[PDB]
Amino acid sequence: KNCNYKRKRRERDWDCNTKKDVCIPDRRYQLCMKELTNLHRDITFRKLYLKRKLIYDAAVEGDLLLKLNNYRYNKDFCKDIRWSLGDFGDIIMGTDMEGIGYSKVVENNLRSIFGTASTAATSRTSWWNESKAQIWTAMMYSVKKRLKGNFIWICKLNVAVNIEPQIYRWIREWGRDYVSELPTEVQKLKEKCDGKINYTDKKVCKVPPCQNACKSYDQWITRKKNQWDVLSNKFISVKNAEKVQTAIVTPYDILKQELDEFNEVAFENEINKRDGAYIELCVCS
């Protein structure tokens, strides 16, 4: 059904339990791969066949993402295009980090086509780099259909096709989720735990629904911290898999680039529950 409609963003939080070395976004789980899953001639013909199947899945993915975006054509939509396109790329290149269920089937199908010799990985990257512009076009079809020649400037093609390791992109995506969730969770804390100027005891000291709001906030921030540690640890593993090391980029550098107002110290305080706002609202001491 993931090729029929998308869950609301953040309806399901990042999943770190299924594959323990990485946290997987719901968007990735829902990536449309129907045609890719449902995959004799020369290998050249079969690659051509693959392209067309990838175009179909990409077109559907872009259509459902736009519907999820309620046809707004805003930054959220363009990010989703970039994330999903990127994931398609990693699937094609064989560097996707999910590799469960039908993703495993898809990887088997691609290996039937490209083989598994020592040149396979390179030729798979070559095929993607040669094809990715058309896949973006396929993903943007639903936009082209409604906006015609003006679809070109809704989202940036170049940004979308520029190759980046999957864990880089997922950290960007995760960060955008975090900054969307944070004020929302702080709202709930404030509403239940906010105090008048002349209070004597914090509400959290003895007021049950404030305590339960703090408990619930604790559960959320504990997930966020867990997710950040897992993704950060995966960032290190993926980096160390690179034969040559770039002499340094950290996950915070990525967050700093993706996010508007990022502040590493503030961020680290929040996920460790030692920020001023949390302490004010949830620590009775």
Numbering used by the authors: 2 to 40, 49 to 256, 258 to 295
Passage from the reporting paper:
P. vivax Duffy Binding Protein (DBP) is a surface protein that the parasite uses to invade host red blood cells and is a leading vaccine candidate. DBP is a member of the Duffy binding-like erythrocyte binding protein (DBL-EBP) family, and binds DARC through a conserved cysteine-rich DBL domain known as region II (DBP-II). DBP-II engages DARC through a multimeric assembly mechanism where two DBP-II domains initially bind one DARC to form a heterotrimer that rapidly recruits a second DARC to form a heterotetramer. Consistent with this view, the most polymorphic region, identified as the DEK epitope, is positioned immediately adjacent to the conserved DARC-binding groove.
To overcome this inherent deficiency of DBP as an immunogen, a novel synthetic DBP-II antigen termed DEKnull was engineered where the polymorphic residues that comprise the DEK epitope were mutated to amino acids not usually present. We obtained the crystal structure of the DEKnull antigen to a resolution of 2.1 Å. DEKnull maintains the overall fold and conserved disulfide bonding patterns of a DBL domain similar to that found in P. vivax DBP Sal1, from which DEKnull is derived. DEKnull also retains the characteristic three sub-domain architecture of DBL domains with critical intra-domain disulfide bonding patterns. All cysteines in DEKnull are involved in disulfide bonding and are structurally conserved with Sal1 DBP-II. Alignment of DEKnull and Sal1 DBP-II structures shows minimal differences with an overall root-mean-square (r.m.s.) deviation of 0.435 Å, indicating there is minimal differences overall between the native and engineered domains. S2 alignment has a r.m.s. deviation of 0.288 Å, and the only change is the region comprising K366 to I376, which is now structured in DEKnull as compared to Sal1 DBP-II. Strikingly, the DEKAQQRRKQ polymorphic stretch within S2 overlaps well between DEKnull and Sal1 DBP-II. Alteration of these amino acids to ASTAATSRTS had no affect on the secondary structure nor do they shift peptide backbone Cαs. The dimerization and DARC binding surfaces overlap well with the parental Sal1 DBP-II; there is no allosteric change to secondary structure or peptide backbone Cαs, retaining the conformational shape of protective targets.
